Each structure stands twice: as C-alpha cells, then as structure tokens.
Design an enzyme around this catalytic site. Structure first.
Site, PDB file in Angstrom:
ATOM      1  CD  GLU A 136      -3.257  -0.599   2.116  1.00  0.00           C
ATOM      2  OE1 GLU A 136      -3.043   0.093   3.123  1.00  0.00           O
ATOM      3  OE2 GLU A 136      -4.371  -1.147   1.919  1.00  0.00           O
ATOM      4  CD  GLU A 225      -5.946  -4.158   3.133  1.00  0.00           C
ATOM      5  OE1 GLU A 225      -6.456  -3.189   2.566  1.00  0.00           O
ATOM      6  OE2 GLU A 225      -5.103  -3.888   4.200  1.00  0.00           O
TER       7      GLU A 225
HETATM    8  C1  LIG Z   1      -4.716  -2.589   4.786  1.00  0.00           C
HETATM    9  O1  LIG Z   1      -5.636  -2.203   5.775  1.00  0.00           O
HETATM   10  C2  LIG Z   1      -5.595  -2.907   7.006  1.00  0.00           C
HETATM   11  C3  LIG Z   1      -6.633  -2.290   7.954  1.00  0.00           C
HETATM   12  O2  LIG Z   1      -6.171  -0.971   8.198  1.00  0.00           O
HETATM   13  C4  LIG Z   1      -4.189  -2.863   7.572  1.00  0.00           C
HETATM   14  O3  LIG Z   1      -4.201  -3.745   8.695  1.00  0.00           O
HETATM   15  C5  LIG Z   1      -4.128  -3.085   9.947  1.00  0.00           C
HETATM   16  O4  LIG Z   1      -2.813  -2.623  10.090  1.00  0.00           O
HETATM   17  C6  LIG Z   1      -2.554  -1.950  11.310  1.00  0.00           C
HETATM   18  C7  LIG Z   1      -1.185  -1.289  11.247  1.00  0.00           C
HETATM   19  O5  LIG Z   1      -0.210  -2.300  11.089  1.00  0.00           O
HETATM   20  C8  LIG Z   1      -2.729  -2.968  12.439  1.00  0.00           C
HETATM   21  O6  LIG Z   1      -2.508  -2.339  13.697  1.00  0.00           O
HETATM   22  C9  LIG Z   1      -1.298  -2.713  14.326  1.00  0.00           C
HETATM   23  O7  LIG Z   1      -1.481  -4.005  14.881  1.00  0.00           O
HETATM   24  C10 LIG Z   1      -0.311  -4.528  15.476  1.00  0.00           C
HETATM   25  C11 LIG Z   1      -0.558  -6.010  15.822  1.00  0.00           C
HETATM   26  O8  LIG Z   1      -1.490  -6.035  16.896  1.00  0.00           O
HETATM   27  C12 LIG Z   1      -0.032  -3.663  16.737  1.00  0.00           C
HETATM   28  O9  LIG Z   1       1.227  -4.089  17.256  1.00  0.00           O
HETATM   29  C13 LIG Z   1       0.172  -2.201  16.259  1.00  0.00           C
HETATM   30  O10 LIG Z   1       0.258  -1.295  17.361  1.00  0.00           O
HETATM   31  C14 LIG Z   1      -1.046  -1.733  15.452  1.00  0.00           C
HETATM   32  O11 LIG Z   1      -0.834  -0.476  14.812  1.00  0.00           O
HETATM   33  C15 LIG Z   1      -4.168  -3.498  12.389  1.00  0.00           C
HETATM   34  O12 LIG Z   1      -4.360  -4.477  13.387  1.00  0.00           O
HETATM   35  C16 LIG Z   1      -4.401  -4.152  11.010  1.00  0.00           C
HETATM   36  O13 LIG Z   1      -5.741  -4.519  10.752  1.00  0.00           O
HETATM   37  C17 LIG Z   1      -3.240  -3.455   6.515  1.00  0.00           C
HETATM   38  O14 LIG Z   1      -1.890  -3.402   6.943  1.00  0.00           O
HETATM   39  C18 LIG Z   1      -3.293  -2.601   5.257  1.00  0.00           C
HETATM   40  F1  LIG Z   1      -2.526  -3.157   4.245  1.00  0.00           F
END
Ligand SMILES: *[C@H]1O[C@H](CO)[C@@H](O[C@@H]2O[C@H](CO)[C@@H](O[C@@H]3O[C@H](CO)[C@@H](O)[C@H](O)[C@H]3O)[C@H](O)[C@H]2O)[C@H](O)[C@H]1F
Ligand SMILES: [Ca+2]
Ligand SMILES: [Ca+2]
Ligand SMILES: [Ca+2]
Ligand SMILES: [Ca+2]
Ligand SMILES: [Ca+2]
EC number: 3.2.1.4
Length: 302
Positions: A136, A225
C-alpha cells in the site's frame, strides 16, 4: 486440485485467465502481519481453509516495517513455509512485500529487489506464485507516475529474470485506491495487475466507480486486501455494504483476499481471540466477519 486445474495464470485484456484462456476468480484470505500473527499461517490452517472454506489463494503479508522483514528477516522463513504449503496443497499463494508505514516503496527498494530475486529464483517455476511488490503506497508525496511506476519498473525485471510469466500485483496510490491513475499510465509487462483495497465501513460507490474507470481502460485489478470493518481494520462490522462489494466483484469477476486471518480483537479479524492456530475451527471460533467471509468463499467454491 486448484492449480492442477488452472495451472499457469496470465492476463488477457485485463482478465485473470488460466492456461486454457478461461476466466479464473481467486477468493481467499490474507494473513495479518507475519511478525505478529504468523502462528496462523501453516500447512494445517491453510489446508483447513482450502477444505472447509474453499479458498484457492492464500496471501502472506510480510510487513517490511513495524518489526517486520527489515529489522528481522527471519520472517522470510514464515513466507517460505506458506509458499511451500500452498504448493503442497495445490492452491495459489501471494508473496506480499507489505509496505504501509514505510509509505513510499522506494524506501526499501534495494531490499525489495533482493527479496524478490531470492523468492523468484526459489519458486519462479511454480504456477502457484503471485508476487505483490508493494502492498500500500500512501501519502500525498507518493504517486503512480513519480514513485510507484518507476519502482515497479525496477523490481519487475528482477523477477522476470528468474520468472518470465507469473502474475505480479502492483500497489497504487492512496492505500492502493488510485487504480484510475495507474490505468491511465499502465506498465508494459503483460502479466501485471493493479491492487485495489477497500473497507466496507469506509468506502462505497465513488470507489466502485473509480475501479470501473480503471477496468474500462483495460487494466487488470486484484483486490488483494479488503475488510468488512472501517479502514483502520476495526471500528465495527459492515456486512450490508460488504455484500454490495461482493456482488460488484462477482459481476466483474475480480479476485480477492480478505483481511485478515488472526485472533486479534478488531472487527476485521476473521477469528475470535484464542482460536486454534492450526485450524479446525468451531463456528464459535469465527468472528462475524469470519463467518460472513467463510460463507462468501464456500458459496462459490467447487
Ligand atoms: C490494509 O488495511 C488494514 C486495515 O487498516 C491494515 O491492517 C491493519 O494494520 C494496522 C497497522 O499495522 C494494524 O494495527 C497494528 O497491529 C499490530 C498487531 O497487533 C499492533 O502491534 C500495532 O500497534 C497496530 O498499529 C491493524 O491491526 C491491522 O488490521 C493493513 O496493513 C493494510 F494493508
Ligand atoms: Ca509441521
Ligand atoms: Ca539472482
Ligand atoms: Ca513462472
Ligand atoms: Ca532507478
Ligand atoms: Ca465467474
């Protein structure tokens, strides 16, 4: 049986087709970040997804940043495990160089080229593999013309040196939403697809129309995605709109991977906290999102 049936995939006038030139529509799951939830990615869970959900594609989301490959390349081991499982299970597999916070693919271009040279050398002869070179791209300073296209023009030849024909999915601007800009300035490689990502609680008709614009320009689009939640991956579950999106993709035969296979307590997660990492889930181990997505894949499987 999936790969035995379709074999080598290719693009024909914007359509994903099999080695006989017939339409192929892949529907599967994406892992969450392998650095956090890699336990859910293994032969047993992939086999269960194949057999119980009907997936024909599995996406291995290898974050580059956020404790991913750049800092700890051992996560590459999980990617190989996933690819090898997909080959054994005869399903397709997407290797995703999962940029996000590192919003310009050019931040780790040298590392990306090195990773894809290795992956394509190892697996380039198997029809199972699909490469996704930049999850992305995002940010107002990151555009198709200035950053993404040139990046792709440097990575693709690296892959093509080892693997002349497997599909390559290329991310687009604004978190892989700006497929219209890509469609107006397409790559020359015949076997490329542009990524389109959406969240049912945030994106609607305007983005559907944007995708249609891209398709009308002859571009191939892979929805690598998409979530049933808001764009953060959380904030509620929106299955009414998710079904609108499902129908839209079926009409256009767009392939897709749902985000995501994890037990994290966030609306888009397919599993409930504590769900068995090797599969064999009870209906109680699936979230509302997971229950819905599983039905969508089963209802079109076989
Ligand atoms: C496409 O979109 C999705 C939904 O936004 C993205 O997936 C999200 O990515 C977030 C950022 O990486 C993630 O949050 C992280 O989760 C980690 C694991 O728990 C935490 O350590 C961290 O603090 C937190 O920011 C969401 O859980 C996840 O759904 C995806 O990456 C994009 F490509
Ligand atoms: Ca084992
Ligand atoms: Ca090499
Ligand atoms: Ca090949
Ligand atoms: Ca260059
Ligand atoms: Ca169809």
């Amino acid at each position: 049986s999936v790969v035995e049936e379709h074999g080598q995939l290719s693009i024909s006038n914007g359509e994903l087709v099999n080695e006989r030139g017939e339409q192929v529509q892949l529907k599967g799951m994406s892992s969450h970040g392998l650095q956090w939830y890699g336990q859910f990615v293994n032969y047993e869970s992939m086999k269960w997804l194949r057999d119980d959900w009907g997936i024909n594609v599995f996406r291995a989301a290898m974050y580059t940043s956020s404790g991913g490959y750049i800092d700890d390349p051992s996560v590459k081991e999980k990617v190989k495990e996933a690819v090898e499982a997909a080959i054994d299970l005869d399903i397709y597999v997407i290797i995703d160089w999962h940029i996000l916070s590192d919003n310009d693919p050019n931040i780790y271009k040298e590392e990306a080229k090195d990773f894809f040279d290795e992956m394509s050398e190892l697996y380039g002869d198997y029809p199972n593999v699909i490469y996704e070179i930049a999850n992305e791209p995002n940010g107002s300073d990151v555009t198709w013309g200035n950053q993404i296209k040139p990046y792709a023009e440097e990575v693709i030849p690296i892959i093509r040196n080892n693997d002349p024909n497997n599909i390559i999915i290329v991310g687009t601007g604004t978190w892989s939403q700006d497929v219209h800009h890509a469609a107006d300035n397409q790559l020359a490689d015949p076997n490329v697809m542009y990524a389109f990502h959406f969240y049912a609680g945030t994106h609607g008709q305007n983005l559907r129309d944007q995708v249609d614009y891209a398709l009308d320009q002859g571009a191939a689009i892979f929805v690598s995605e998409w979530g049933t939640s808001a764009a953060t991956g959380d904030g509620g579950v929106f299955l009414d709109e998710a079904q609108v999106w499902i129908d839209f993709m079926d009409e256009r035969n767009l392939s897709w991977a749902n985000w995501s296979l994890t037990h994290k307590d966030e609306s888009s997660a397919a599993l409930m906290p504590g769900a068995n990492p090797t599969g064999g889930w009870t209906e109680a181990e699936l979230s509302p999102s997971g229950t819905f997505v599983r039905e969508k894949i089963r209802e079109s499987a076989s």
